């Protein structure tokens, strides 16, 4: 049944909403972002509502479609995510490891725009597999 494919697309969209939450906080706090292996990590199950050590993560669609990413060591930074595979969003290339915060043509807003555009084809597939 399609609920497994909805869960799969929900795993992408949950992680993209975690990224957007970190970006919206950075925009609010006047902060630049570090996205490489020294930055924020996306393996922690509490990002997806499961408790610390809760064995529901072991079968969860969120941990499954993120441990099984071609950049995963056991950890996964935002860049290891934003450079990884496979995904139904496809994936970006050429992304720089830090973005500063600056007053005109602000790099974090250009980054937020870049993430937002590729998130829209994922929202189309979520609208689809939520309405089916």
């Amino acid at each position, epitope marked *: 049944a399609l609920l497994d494919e909805l869960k799969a697309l929900t795993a992408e969209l949950k992680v993209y909403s975690v990224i957007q939450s970190q970006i919206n906080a950075a925009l609010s706090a006047k902060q630049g972002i570090r996205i*490489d*292996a*020294g930055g924020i990590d996306l393996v922690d199950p509490t990002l997806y509502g499961y408790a610390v050590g809760d064995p529901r993560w072991k079968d969860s669609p969120e941990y499954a479609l993120l441990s*099984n990413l*071609d*950049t*995963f*060591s*056991g950890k996964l930074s935002i*860049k*290891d995510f934003l*450079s*990884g*595979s*496979p995904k139904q969003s496809g994936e970006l*290339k*050429g*992304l*720089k*490891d830090e973005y500063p915060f600056e007053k005109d043509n602000n790099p974090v807003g250009n980054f937020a725009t870049t993430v937002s555009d590729r998130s829209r084809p994922l929202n189309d597939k979520v609208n689809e597999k939520t309405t089916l």
Partner: antibody, heavy 122, light 111 residues
Framework: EGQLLESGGGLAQPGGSLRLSCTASGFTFSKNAMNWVRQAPGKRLEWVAGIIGNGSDTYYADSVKGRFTISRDNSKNTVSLQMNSLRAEDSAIYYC???????????????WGQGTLVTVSS | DIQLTQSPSTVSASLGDRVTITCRASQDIGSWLAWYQQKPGKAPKLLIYKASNVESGVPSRFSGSESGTEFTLTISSLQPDDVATYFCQYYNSYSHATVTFGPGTKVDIKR
């Protein structure tokens, strides 16, 4: 089979800055990608291997972390210390590698570069 | 990641000889494996493949076997090229390095 071929096999000044290159033959970036391995002088020391996890993805121990901010292309795939204080410990041989597969189809291609040196001397 | 040690190996008796080189792992993943070969003054090369599901092995003179916390390379027709060797893997299915390779042990081919 596919080919790799480096350039800039010369010189830098200690605490200065440096930029190497690839020129990967007909390469189109994919699921499999390129990565940069630091052959140490003579002996294969432990923490050496597997810098740049995938294309532009910076990764190492803290001993170089933040220096290795690689650029992009479809062929130049450039390891780089452009403002980033090249140390005596960073004199080594830097190899392109590619994530090969067996099974006779595409990606079964000999996968290591010709090994660009880096001299440091004042 | 997993630390490794590689031993033993010595000179062949001849061309066409048999030698078996082992390694020990400080930590576990299963049999996620490959061997790299370093001819002198050259780019390194790749040897063995297939994971904990030990599907079919390697063409020509190469072979290897694993259990517990050890893995091993047997060469059954040891040739004059075959003069340094190493172990590796990183976690998904193939390529890269264990942040260290398994640090190798000399090989040489006799007259």
């Amino acid at each position: 089979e596919g080919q790799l071929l480096e350039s800039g096999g010369g010189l830098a000044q200690p605490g200065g800055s440096l930029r190497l290159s690839c020129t990967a033959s007909g390469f189109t970036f994919s699921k499999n990608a390129m990565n940069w391995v630091r052959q140490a002088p003579g002996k294969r020391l432990e923490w050496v291997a597997g810098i740049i996890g995938n294309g532009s993805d910076t990764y190492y121990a803290d001993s170089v972390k933040g220096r290795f901010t690689i650029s992009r292309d479809n062929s130049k795939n450039t390891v780089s210390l452009q403002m980033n204080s090249l140390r005596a410990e960073d004199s080594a041989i830097y190899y392109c590698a590619k994530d090969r597969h067996p099974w006779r189809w595409l990606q079964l291609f000999d996968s290591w570069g010709q090994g660009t040196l880096v001299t440091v001397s004042s | 990641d997993i630390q490794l040690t590689q031993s033993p190996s010595t000179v062949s008796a001849s061309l066409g000889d048999r030698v078996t080189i082992t390694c020990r792992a400080s930590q576990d993943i299963g049999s996620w494996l490959a061997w790299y070969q370093q001819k002198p003054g050259k780019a390194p090369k790749l040897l063995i493949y297939k994971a904990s599901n030990v599907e079919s092995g390697v063409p020509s003179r190469f072979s290897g076997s694993e259990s517990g916390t050890e893995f091993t390379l047997t060469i059954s027709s040891l040739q004059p090229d075959d003069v340094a060797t190493y172990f590796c893997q990183y976690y998904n299915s193939y390529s890269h390095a264990t942040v260290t390779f398994g640090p190798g042990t000399k090989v040489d081919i006799k007259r």
